Design a protein around this nucleic acid. Structure first.
Length: 577
DNA sequence: GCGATCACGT
DNA sequence: CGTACGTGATCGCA
């Protein structure tokens, strides 16, 4: 049983408690808090939010760093409280992060899923209480209050066994010194938001919409017909049935119309280049112009992403609603979208710092490949050096095409090395890609050794680890299905690289946050994009930041090779280039 | 409401 | 069939 409390009392403010600050809306920014549960040594309590969040003693308890709280997904609550002007401190255990570190592949997304990991089932899944999608709703107080108290009681019961397993995994410091401090930094980042120049976006959208009508009309005059270009159904019967274009690859139901295939088809018909142009314009228009404008808060012209900290299998963050980690930059037309991301105050600038080749530097260090480490010690262009070695030529003999292919091997080697994906990527045969690999491994024998040894260790231990002891279990490494096994071997090779890079930038974020506060700087972290950090700061702080941010990022860990950080600043995200 | 394509990023 | 890891939009079916 539990107390359905009318007012806050002192026994609810013990210095240790499991706390539930329930925000049911998926996007928690400026979202309602529907209820609160506290379990401590004195009892189990449900508090209505409009009561507890108005009680200065409860608010003081929330904000006291010496009163320790155990929670599930504290960042959700922390941010929902930030929007009410209330500080959340003292969160010493986050069950969501603890479950994520113990096994990311469980997809642990609620308290019930995490409790099942320890044979605790006295709590319902959120989706069983709230419903799914359309039918989603907050239930009556008795049903809500029992759910929140069952979640708090589970967190209370589950902290010792999770912490015990984290300790056995040598992951206790990972949780307490990396992921939980990082949760607080991400909350500040999401709450700060990023300013959007919405007239610029709107003006871009009208230009795209003009160029989309023109290209659309050209596609119809080239097909002799009107049809929905956005549908691979109709597009396939225009291209491969009406126009008789060669079918270079079939999908499951019909024909494939990837940009992979269409570029091969361009010699045969003028329609193909126009379809490709239509698709690129439509992507910007749909995902990045209209998509962004839909999530901008009209009162502040800011977007407030949500960083999913417990989702990827490698330890990367992900970014939702909006995804600020896939804003275009490769092609110039779409890169202009970054002009609409601006500082949130006058006379501030955007500052962006990015690791140079962090994955291949981590691999140099992890593999202790003499040739790879020396390449980075000499600060070589790694793709050109790899080409010199694979093709056995001097620097001046590296053609652009050789460097492009050596680059593809290098991006392949970070992924699962297997040829078919390189052969597909380089539009070559398996037979030829295989010999690319063989010549790479003759040049970097320590990488070869590391790739053999890590697959062997994944089979022996059942998991691979990153630099800071993140793990990923790989049960498919023993499968007798060749596809399933190969996927697990590729993950065994990639995950210590991709995941160690993720560890490093997360530690840098923590180190950067500490330094900016020590230095009393107004600069604020806004975004992380896997290997870059994006800040905004007063114009008067740029010179100091040029020295500070790269140093902190470069010194986050000490590897057998240097870490290298490039950085740029400008009046928009675009100009920070 | 829900897989399958497709395309955007690192 | 497979390059690694994500998110979002569109379509099409039931």
């Amino acid at each position: 049983a539990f107390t359905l409390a009318d007012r806050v009392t002192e026994e609810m403010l013990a210095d240790k408690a499991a706390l539930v600050v329930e925000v049911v809306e998926e996007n928690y920014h400026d979202a309602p808090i529907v209820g609160i549960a506290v379990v401590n040594e004195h009892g189990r309590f449900f508090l209505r939010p409009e009561t507890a969040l108005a009680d200065p003693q409860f608010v003081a308890w929330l904000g006291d760093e010496t009163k320790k709280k155990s929670m599930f997904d504290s960042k959700r609550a922390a941010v929902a409280l930030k929007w009410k002007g209330i500080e959340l401190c003292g969160v010493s255990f986050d069950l969501l992060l603890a479950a994520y570190l113990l096994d990311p592949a469980q997809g642990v997304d609620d308290v019930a899923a995490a409790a099942k990991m320890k044979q605790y089932e006295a709590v319902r899944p959120d989706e069983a209480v709230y419903g799914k999608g359309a039918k989603r709703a907050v239930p009556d107080e008795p049903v809500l209050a029992e759910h929140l108290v069952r979640k708090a009681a589970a967190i209370w019961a589950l902290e010792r066994p999770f912490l015990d397993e984290l300790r056995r995994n040598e992951q206790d410091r990972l949780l307490v010194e990396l992921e939980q401090p990082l949760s607080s930094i991400l909350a500040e980042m999401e709450f700060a938001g990023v300013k959007v120049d919405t007239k610029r976006l709107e003006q871009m959208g009208e230009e795209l919409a003009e160029q989309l009508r023109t290209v659309e009309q050209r596609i119809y005059e080239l097909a002799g017909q009107e049809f929905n270009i956005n549908s691979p159904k109709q597009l396939g019967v225009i291209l491969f049935e009406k126009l008789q274009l060669p079918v270079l690859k079939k999908t499951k139901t019909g024909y494939s119309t990837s940009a992979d295939v269409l570029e091969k088809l361009a010699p045969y018909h003028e329609i193909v280049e126009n379809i490709l142009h239509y698709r690129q314009l439509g992507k910007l228009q749909s995902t990045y112009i209209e998509g962004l404008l839909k999530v901008v808060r009209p009162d502040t012209k800011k977007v407030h992403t949500i960083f999913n900290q417990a989702l990827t299998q490698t330890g990367r963050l992900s970014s939702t609603e909006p995804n600020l980690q896939n804003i275009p930059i490769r092609l110039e037309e779409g890169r202009k979208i970054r002009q609409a991301f601006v500082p949130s105050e006058s006379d501030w600038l955007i500052f962006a710092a990015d690791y140079s080749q962090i994955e291949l530097r981590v691999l140099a260090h992890i593999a202790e490949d003499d040739n790879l480490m020396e390449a980075f010690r000499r600060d070589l262009d790694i793709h050109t050096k790899t080409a010199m070695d694979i093709f056995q030529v001097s620097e001046d003999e590296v053609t652009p095409n050789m460097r492009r292919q050596a680059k593809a091997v290098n991006f392949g080697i970070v992924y699962g090395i297997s040829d078919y994906g390189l052969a597909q990527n380089l539009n070559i045969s398996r037979k030829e890609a295989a010999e690319f690999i063989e010549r790479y491994f003759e040049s970097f024998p320590g990488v070869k050794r590391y790739m053999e040894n890590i697959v062997q260790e994944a089979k022996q231990k059942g998991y691979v680890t990153t630099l800071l002891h993140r793990r990923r279990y790989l049960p498919d490494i023993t499968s007798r299905n060749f596809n399933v096994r190969s996927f697990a071997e590729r993950m065994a090779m990639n995950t210590p690289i991709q995941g160690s890079a993720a560890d490093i930038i997360k530690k840098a974020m923590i180190d950067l946050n500490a330094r900016l506060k020590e230095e009393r700087l107004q600069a604020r972290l806004l975004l992380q994009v896997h290997d870059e950090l994006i800040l905004e700061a007063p114009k008067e702080e740029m010179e100091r930041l040029c020295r500070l941010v790269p140093e902190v990022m470069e010194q986050a860990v000490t590897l057998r090779v240097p870490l290298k950080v490039d950085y740029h600043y400008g009046s928009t995200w675009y100009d920070a280039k």
